[PDB]
Ligand binder design. Structure first.
Ligand SMILES: [Mg+2]
Ligand SMILES: [Mg+2]
Ligand SMILES: [Mg+2]
Ligand SMILES: [Mg+2]
Ligand SMILES: [Mg+2]
Ligand SMILES: [Mg+2]
Ligand SMILES: [Mg+2]
Ligand SMILES: [Mg+2]
Ligand SMILES: [Mg+2]
Ligand SMILES: [Mg+2]
Ligand SMILES: [Mg+2]
Ligand SMILES: [Mg+2]
Ligand SMILES: [Mg+2]
Ligand SMILES: [Mg+2]
Ligand SMILES: [Mg+2]
Ligand SMILES: [Mg+2]
Ligand SMILES: [Mg+2]
Ligand SMILES: [Mg+2]
Ligand SMILES: [Mg+2]
Ligand SMILES: [Mg+2]
Ligand SMILES: [Mg+2]
Ligand SMILES: [Mg+2]
Ligand SMILES: [Mg+2]
Ligand SMILES: [Mg+2]
Ligand SMILES: [Mg+2]
Ligand SMILES: [Mg+2]
Ligand SMILES: [Mg+2]
Ligand SMILES: [Mg+2]
Ligand SMILES: [Mg+2]
Ligand SMILES: [Mg+2]
Ligand SMILES: [Mg+2]
Ligand SMILES: [Mg+2]
Ligand SMILES: [Mg+2]
Ligand SMILES: [Mg+2]
Ligand SMILES: [Mg+2]
Ligand SMILES: [Mg+2]
Ligand SMILES: [Mg+2]
Ligand SMILES: [Mg+2]
Ligand SMILES: [Mg+2]
Ligand SMILES: [Mg+2]
Ligand SMILES: [Mg+2]
Ligand SMILES: [Mg+2]
Ligand SMILES: [Mg+2]
Ligand SMILES: [Mg+2]
Ligand SMILES: [Mg+2]
Ligand SMILES: [Mg+2]
Ligand SMILES: [Mg+2]
Ligand SMILES: [Mg+2]
Ligand SMILES: [Mg+2]
Ligand SMILES: [Mg+2]
Ligand SMILES: [Mg+2]
Ligand SMILES: [Mg+2]
Ligand SMILES: [Mg+2]
Ligand SMILES: [Mg+2]
Ligand SMILES: [Mg+2]
Ligand SMILES: [Mg+2]
Ligand SMILES: [Mg+2]
Ligand SMILES: [Mg+2]
Ligand SMILES: [Mg+2]
Ligand SMILES: [Mg+2]
Ligand SMILES: [Mg+2]
Ligand SMILES: [Mg+2]
Ligand SMILES: [Mg+2]
Ligand SMILES: [Mg+2]
Ligand SMILES: [Mg+2]
Ligand SMILES: [Mg+2]
Ligand SMILES: [Mg+2]
Ligand SMILES: [Mg+2]
Ligand SMILES: [Mg+2]
Ligand SMILES: [Mg+2]
Ligand SMILES: [Mg+2]
Ligand SMILES: [Mg+2]
Ligand SMILES: [Mg+2]
Ligand SMILES: [Mg+2]
Ligand SMILES: [Mg+2]
Ligand SMILES: [Mg+2]
Ligand SMILES: [Mg+2]
Ligand SMILES: [Mg+2]
Ligand SMILES: [Mg+2]
Ligand SMILES: [Mg+2]
Ligand SMILES: [Mg+2]
Ligand SMILES: [Mg+2]
Ligand SMILES: [Mg+2]
Ligand SMILES: [Mg+2]
Ligand SMILES: [Mg+2]
Ligand SMILES: [Mg+2]
Ligand SMILES: [Mg+2]
Ligand SMILES: [Mg+2]
Ligand SMILES: [Mg+2]
Ligand SMILES: [Mg+2]
Ligand SMILES: [Mg+2]
Ligand SMILES: [Mg+2]
Ligand SMILES: [Mg+2]
Ligand SMILES: [Mg+2]
Ligand SMILES: [Mg+2]
Ligand SMILES: [Mg+2]
Ligand SMILES: [Mg+2]
Ligand SMILES: [Mg+2]
Ligand SMILES: [Mg+2]
Ligand SMILES: [Mg+2]
Ligand SMILES: [Mg+2]
Ligand SMILES: [Mg+2]
Ligand SMILES: [Mg+2]
Ligand SMILES: [Mg+2]
Ligand SMILES: [Mg+2]
Ligand SMILES: [Mg+2]
Ligand SMILES: [Mg+2]
Ligand SMILES: [Mg+2]
Ligand SMILES: [Mg+2]
Ligand SMILES: [Mg+2]
Ligand SMILES: [Mg+2]
Ligand SMILES: [Mg+2]
Ligand SMILES: [Mg+2]
Ligand SMILES: [Mg+2]
Ligand SMILES: [Mg+2]
Ligand SMILES: [Mg+2]
Ligand SMILES: [Mg+2]
Ligand SMILES: [Mg+2]
Ligand SMILES: [Mg+2]
Ligand SMILES: [Mg+2]
Ligand SMILES: [Mg+2]
Ligand SMILES: [Mg+2]
Ligand SMILES: [Mg+2]
Ligand SMILES: [Mg+2]
Ligand SMILES: [Mg+2]
Ligand SMILES: [Mg+2]
Ligand SMILES: [Mg+2]
Ligand SMILES: [Mg+2]
Ligand SMILES: [Mg+2]
Ligand SMILES: [Mg+2]
Ligand SMILES: [Mg+2]
Ligand SMILES: [Mg+2]
Ligand SMILES: [Mg+2]
Ligand SMILES: [Mg+2]
Ligand SMILES: [Mg+2]
Ligand SMILES: [Mg+2]
Ligand SMILES: [Mg+2]
Ligand SMILES: [Mg+2]
Ligand SMILES: [Mg+2]
Ligand SMILES: [Mg+2]
Ligand SMILES: [Mg+2]
Ligand SMILES: [Mg+2]
Ligand SMILES: [Mg+2]
Ligand SMILES: [Mg+2]
Ligand SMILES: [Mg+2]
Ligand SMILES: [Mg+2]
Ligand SMILES: [Mg+2]
Ligand SMILES: [Mg+2]
Ligand SMILES: [Mg+2]
Ligand SMILES: [Mg+2]
Ligand SMILES: [Mg+2]
Ligand SMILES: [Mg+2]
Ligand SMILES: [Mg+2]
Ligand SMILES: [Mg+2]
Ligand SMILES: [Mg+2]
Ligand SMILES: [Mg+2]
Ligand SMILES: [Mg+2]
Ligand SMILES: [Mg+2]
Ligand SMILES: [Mg+2]
Ligand SMILES: [Mg+2]
Ligand SMILES: [Mg+2]
Ligand SMILES: [Mg+2]
Ligand SMILES: [Mg+2]
Ligand SMILES: [Mg+2]
Ligand SMILES: [Mg+2]
Ligand SMILES: [Mg+2]
Ligand SMILES: [Mg+2]
Ligand SMILES: [Mg+2]
Ligand SMILES: [Mg+2]
Ligand SMILES: [Mg+2]
Ligand SMILES: [Mg+2]
Ligand SMILES: [Mg+2]
Ligand SMILES: [Mg+2]
Ligand SMILES: [Mg+2]
Ligand SMILES: [Mg+2]
Ligand SMILES: [Mg+2]
Ligand SMILES: [Mg+2]
Ligand SMILES: [Mg+2]
Ligand SMILES: [Mg+2]
Ligand SMILES: [Mg+2]
Ligand SMILES: [Mg+2]
Ligand SMILES: [Mg+2]
Ligand SMILES: [Mg+2]
Lengths: 147, 97
RNA sequence: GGGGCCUGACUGCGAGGCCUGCAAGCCGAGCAGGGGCGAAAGCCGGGCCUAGUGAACCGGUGGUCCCGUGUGGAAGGGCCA
RNA sequence: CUGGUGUUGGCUCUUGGUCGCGCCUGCGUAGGAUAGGUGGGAGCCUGUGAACCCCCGCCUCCGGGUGGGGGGGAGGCGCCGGUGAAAUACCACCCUGGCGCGGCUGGGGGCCUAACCCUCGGAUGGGGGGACAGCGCUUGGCGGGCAGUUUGACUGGGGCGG
RNA sequence: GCGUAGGGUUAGGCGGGACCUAAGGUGAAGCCGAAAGGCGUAGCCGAAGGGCAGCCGGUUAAUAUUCCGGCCCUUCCCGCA
RNA sequence: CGUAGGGAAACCGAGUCCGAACAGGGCGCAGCGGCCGCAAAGUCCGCGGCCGUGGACCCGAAACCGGGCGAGCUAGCCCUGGCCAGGGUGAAGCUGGGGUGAGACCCAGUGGAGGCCCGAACCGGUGGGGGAUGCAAACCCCUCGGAUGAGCUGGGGCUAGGAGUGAAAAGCUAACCGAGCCCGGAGAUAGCUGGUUCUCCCCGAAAUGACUUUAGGGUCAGCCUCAGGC
RNA sequence: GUGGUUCGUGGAGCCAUGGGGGAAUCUGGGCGGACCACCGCCUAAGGCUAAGUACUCCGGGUGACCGAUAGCGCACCAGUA
RNA sequence: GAGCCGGUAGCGGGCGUGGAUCCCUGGAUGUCCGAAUGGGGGAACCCGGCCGGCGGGAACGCCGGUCACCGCGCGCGCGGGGGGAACCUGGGGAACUGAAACAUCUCAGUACCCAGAGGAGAGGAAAGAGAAAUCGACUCCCUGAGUAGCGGCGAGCGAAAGGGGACCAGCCUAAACCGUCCGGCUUGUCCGGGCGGGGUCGUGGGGCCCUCGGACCGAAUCCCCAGCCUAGCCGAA
């Protein structure tokens, strides 16, 4: 029998995959224990469908991000701070970075997503990964300068 | 030895025929009937315990339409069925046939 | 009884008859086809004779090429042995 | 009573057949040497490092083959002709048989569990049996347990005999 | 002890019920069978078993532990303590 | 239905089939007077005899089958109650004495066991006589068996027809049980027996042969009869 | 493996189905007597549907039907004694 | 339209033109049993719950109403249960007998049992028939025909097409597609179940998509009527 799986089963089939097994195994084991479903027509479309949405949203974000990147990638985040020479007095944080991109360039963001373990303390020209969507990183150059 | 609850099958009556000798096609005189006696042929009925609406439903259905039971089940999802009792969920399914 | 060449221990029929409850069983001249023995006339349709047998139904084998279930074939049959 | 199949599922071992691949293997006069067949076919080889030396398995018709590993590290076999019915470097497609992975099945062993069956003051569950048993279609057998019948005529009465 | 007509059987306590269970019968649940129907814990039905409060005498042509008489008793409803 | 038949058939056709045949054979093929009338193959309805199919001339089985009715008789079991006068023998156990190392065991009293004994009711039915269109479709009298047991018994129940029960006789299952009774299939079948109704008139048999699971029944021939023809 | 049809396994199709395996949507599928092809007919696996047809407890008409052993078992107080 | 209080006279009393008895249609009443159904039950008997009334009425008793089970449908409503002489269809289904024994075979899917239906029941609008290059639902009768065929090819069984008649009639759904209400979790372009639309055929048809064109048929359900039935009346000499 062709069936639809609800939980991946070792050396058998991946979740959502469609396999063909002995009817005894399918109806006295896999269907009872909510472990799979008849590869019918009725609840066969419902599988053909959720793949679309789950493929639609992911495909949506992986584009609502690429849409972002292009926004960045073609600009620079300048941060004025008080400091003498290359070492800063205070510090520039992601939450700081946020204010800027929010302040200038009218963009909103999540600092937690941004890659920056240690809060910046010296000036210079920095490129930092925001990581809004995995496999879809961003390179945002931030010019931290004083005065 | 009864009635399929899904196919309406039922014990029919068949004859038990006893034949002897060589057929013609085998280059023989021909077959000869030595004794005809009524038998009766049963549908291969079996049990089909299923749980529906948190309730166990079991059919005495023939082995042929077994895959129809689950169909009924699968088809019964779109029904107010909680709160009911066994005989109630059976009759509600059968109405789908 | 001996021997020579031979296959009539024929095919296709068969007038007329014995016998006879039916059905069977029996004798059979002669005509053609093709042959055999004979110089020829002629004989030869197994055996000097009278028993050595078994009706139909069903089926087997060879042959015929008659029917072939819309049509051409085949299945399966019928006729001959 | 019994084999096949439906109810009827899961995993592993050991054997059987198959297709899929890595592969390898084939022994007459003759002829370098151990020729599987029909080809394609007069060039193929080496830093995907050569003739030749040694170390392990592999088959060994006792002659070799192949895989290899190190040294060296740049040579070797083709057509040419020897030769036989068929002849060689090389590149495919098929066989011989045999080996390992994968297939898909058939048997046997072992163990599960969830169908099925029995059980449990409690039961969407626990526990034992366990895909056997029970049951359905079917094969073949045993089968006076029951059922329908047959068990001849002539005959100095019938039967025995004939 | 026959034909016609008339009269005669009086119970809160005797027997049976509105009380109970037996074999068996039926039979929510549940199981089974071509139909008819066949099973089946509980429950219900089921007696000459269990349980329950009347003894004596008189009376009538015909009934009485039934009416009468005397002396006892049971259960239920209401009310008081 | 008839007008065309022959052949297994294609198919031919007054011919056709077996066959090489123009051969031989099988089954087949053709009105009366003077156009008329008359007759006829054939066909149609009537009437009559006979035959086939149905109960088929009438009555009769022993039996087979189907669906129902019966355990108020009788057989076994289940539930609940009842009955067994009186007398006789006198087991184990107990008490005591004797007995021994303790015992086993022996005797006397108590005691009251048993498909124990004699004998009524109750249940039975051994032998004899009576009875025999009986008092009685199993009875009467005399004798007899058991009679605290595997006993008898009232009441309520269950088991049935190829089935029930059966201390077993194939006994019983509503007075006949080798498969109950009723009703139906049904008018079963009957090659057997019986029974077959008015009159007169003419003829007038057979009881043989052959075959026949045939021998007391049937098919053909034989012998009888009727109509027409020669 | 059976049943129906004239079809008793027969060459055995067609209609129906108890068991097993198990599709397709007009370029589909069943059929025309095993099977193959050509040619044709039809369009299953849901259902409904008047009249013409059958019977006679009932009422009526009518008989070369009976006339109290006949005619229904009952002409009458009969499914009665 | 003049007698009546049944067959039934009598005793004893009434009624009727102020139209009786009698006949026909509707209505009321209609104890108890019976499918029997409140519960039981050895049918016509026995014992209860609820609401309301009577009696002096609380116990007791009578009166009226209501209370069994099943199916279907959102405790309450519509339906079922049983009977009927045969006739009808479905589920089952013998035997004697015939074959001059008998088993296949026949008797026969008849008799019988069971469920169901109805004034009729079944069948019925071709996935048909079968050789006409044709027929056109089904049912019944004739005929085809004891033909074709079936058969221990024994006894026996026994069609269909076509033709002539009676009657005459054809329809609704399922699926694709549009919409809508509900519920499931695994959140939609989803799946599932209701309802509505649409659609129903074989020269194949239908849906969706464009394009062109925009009244006559008519019920088997409903209504009115004639006609008919269930009592009757006039009727020549
Ligand atoms: Mg069989
Ligand atoms: Mg043959
Ligand atoms: Mg045969
Ligand atoms: Mg199951
Ligand atoms: Mg299957
Ligand atoms: Mg369906
Ligand atoms: Mg000589
Ligand atoms: Mg000689
Ligand atoms: Mg010569
Ligand atoms: Mg002659
Ligand atoms: Mg002769
Ligand atoms: Mg002879
Ligand atoms: Mg000659
Ligand atoms: Mg000559
Ligand atoms: Mg010569
Ligand atoms: Mg001659
Ligand atoms: Mg001789
Ligand atoms: Mg001689
Ligand atoms: Mg002989
Ligand atoms: Mg014979
Ligand atoms: Mg010829
Ligand atoms: Mg043909
Ligand atoms: Mg020919
Ligand atoms: Mg051809
Ligand atoms: Mg050929
Ligand atoms: Mg042939
Ligand atoms: Mg032949
Ligand atoms: Mg198996
Ligand atoms: Mg184990
Ligand atoms: Mg098994
Ligand atoms: Mg079972
Ligand atoms: Mg068998
Ligand atoms: Mg015996
Ligand atoms: Mg035997
Ligand atoms: Mg017997
Ligand atoms: Mg016997
Ligand atoms: Mg017989
Ligand atoms: Mg004899
Ligand atoms: Mg003789
Ligand atoms: Mg003698
Ligand atoms: Mg004598
Ligand atoms: Mg004699
Ligand atoms: Mg003699
Ligand atoms: Mg003898
Ligand atoms: Mg007296
Ligand atoms: Mg008197
Ligand atoms: Mg007098
Ligand atoms: Mg008096
Ligand atoms: Mg008193
Ligand atoms: Mg009392
Ligand atoms: Mg009371
Ligand atoms: Mg009680
Ligand atoms: Mg019962
Ligand atoms: Mg009980
Ligand atoms: Mg009570
Ligand atoms: Mg009592
Ligand atoms: Mg008492
Ligand atoms: Mg008392
Ligand atoms: Mg008392
Ligand atoms: Mg007292
Ligand atoms: Mg008195
Ligand atoms: Mg107080
Ligand atoms: Mg001739
Ligand atoms: Mg002639
Ligand atoms: Mg004339
Ligand atoms: Mg005539
Ligand atoms: Mg005759
Ligand atoms: Mg008859
Ligand atoms: Mg007669
Ligand atoms: Mg008689
Ligand atoms: Mg008789
Ligand atoms: Mg018998
Ligand atoms: Mg018998
Ligand atoms: Mg008794
Ligand atoms: Mg008794
Ligand atoms: Mg006894
Ligand atoms: Mg007792
Ligand atoms: Mg007692
Ligand atoms: Mg005594
Ligand atoms: Mg005593
Ligand atoms: Mg004592
Ligand atoms: Mg002592
Ligand atoms: Mg004593
Ligand atoms: Mg005694
Ligand atoms: Mg004694
Ligand atoms: Mg006795
Ligand atoms: Mg005596
Ligand atoms: Mg005796
Ligand atoms: Mg005596
Ligand atoms: Mg005496
Ligand atoms: Mg005597
Ligand atoms: Mg005597
Ligand atoms: Mg008598
Ligand atoms: Mg006597
Ligand atoms: Mg006496
Ligand atoms: Mg005595
Ligand atoms: Mg005595
Ligand atoms: Mg005794
Ligand atoms: Mg005694
Ligand atoms: Mg006792
Ligand atoms: Mg008793
Ligand atoms: Mg008793
Ligand atoms: Mg009794
Ligand atoms: Mg019984
Ligand atoms: Mg009997
Ligand atoms: Mg009987
Ligand atoms: Mg019976
Ligand atoms: Mg017995
Ligand atoms: Mg009797
Ligand atoms: Mg008797
Ligand atoms: Mg008998
Ligand atoms: Mg008797
Ligand atoms: Mg009857
Ligand atoms: Mg008969
Ligand atoms: Mg007989
Ligand atoms: Mg006379
Ligand atoms: Mg004679
Ligand atoms: Mg003869
Ligand atoms: Mg013989
Ligand atoms: Mg004799
Ligand atoms: Mg004669
Ligand atoms: Mg004459
Ligand atoms: Mg048959
Ligand atoms: Mg055959
Ligand atoms: Mg057949
Ligand atoms: Mg046909
Ligand atoms: Mg099937
Ligand atoms: Mg097509
Ligand atoms: Mg196709
Ligand atoms: Mg078909
Ligand atoms: Mg087919
Ligand atoms: Mg076909
Ligand atoms: Mg066809
Ligand atoms: Mg054909
Ligand atoms: Mg075609
Ligand atoms: Mg057709
Ligand atoms: Mg269709
Ligand atoms: Mg219908
Ligand atoms: Mg109608
Ligand atoms: Mg009609
Ligand atoms: Mg009448
Ligand atoms: Mg008269
Ligand atoms: Mg008369
Ligand atoms: Mg009379
Ligand atoms: Mg009479
Ligand atoms: Mg008279
Ligand atoms: Mg009167
Ligand atoms: Mg008077
Ligand atoms: Mg009253
Ligand atoms: Mg009642
Ligand atoms: Mg009752
Ligand atoms: Mg009240
Ligand atoms: Mg009162
Ligand atoms: Mg009341
Ligand atoms: Mg009815
Ligand atoms: Mg039928
Ligand atoms: Mg039977
Ligand atoms: Mg018979
Ligand atoms: Mg008969
Ligand atoms: Mg006969
Ligand atoms: Mg007959
Ligand atoms: Mg017979
Ligand atoms: Mg006979
Ligand atoms: Mg016999
Ligand atoms: Mg028959
Ligand atoms: Mg029937
Ligand atoms: Mg009924
Ligand atoms: Mg009825
Ligand atoms: Mg009508
Ligand atoms: Mg109808
Ligand atoms: Mg249609
Ligand atoms: Mg004809
Ligand atoms: Mg005819
Ligand atoms: Mg024959
Ligand atoms: Mg027949
Ligand atoms: Mg017709
Ligand atoms: Mg016609
Ligand atoms: Mg008419
Ligand atoms: Mg028409
Ligand atoms: Mg919808
Ligand atoms: Mg189209
Ligand atoms: Mg309509
Ligand atoms: Mg008048």
């Amino acid at each position: 029998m062709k069936v639809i799986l609800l939980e991946p089963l070792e050396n058998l089939g991946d979740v959502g995959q469609v396999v063909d097994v002995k009817p005894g195994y399918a109806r006295n084991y896999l269907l009872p224990r909510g472990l799979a479903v008849l590869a019918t027509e009725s609840n066969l479309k419902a599988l053909e469908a959720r793949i679309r949405a789950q493929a639609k949203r992911l495909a949506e974000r992986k584009a609502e991000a690429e849409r972002l990147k292009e926004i960045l990638e073609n600009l620079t985040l300048t941060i004025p701070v008080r400091a003498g020479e290359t070492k800063i007095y205070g510090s520039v944080t992601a939450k700081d970075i946020a204010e800027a991109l929010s302040r200038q360039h009218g963009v909103t963001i999540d600092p937690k997503r941004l890659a920056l373990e240690k809060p910046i303390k010296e000036l210079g020209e920095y490129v930092l990964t925001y990581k809004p969507h995995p496999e879809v990183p961003i390179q945002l150059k931030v010019s931290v300068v004083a005065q | 030895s009864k009635v399929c609850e899904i196919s309406g099958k039922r014990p029919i009556v068949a004859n038990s025929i006893q034949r002897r000798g060589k057929a013609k096609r085998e280059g023989g005189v021909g077959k000869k009937t030595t004794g005809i006696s009524k038998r009766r042929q049963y549908p291969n009925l079996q049990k089909v315990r299923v749980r529906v609406a948190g309730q166990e439903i079991t059919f005495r259905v023939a082995a042929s339409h077994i895959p129809k039971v689950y169909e009924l089940v699968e088809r019964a999802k779109g029904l107010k069925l909680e709160g009911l009792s066994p005989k109630e969920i059976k009759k509600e399914l059968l109405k789908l046939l």
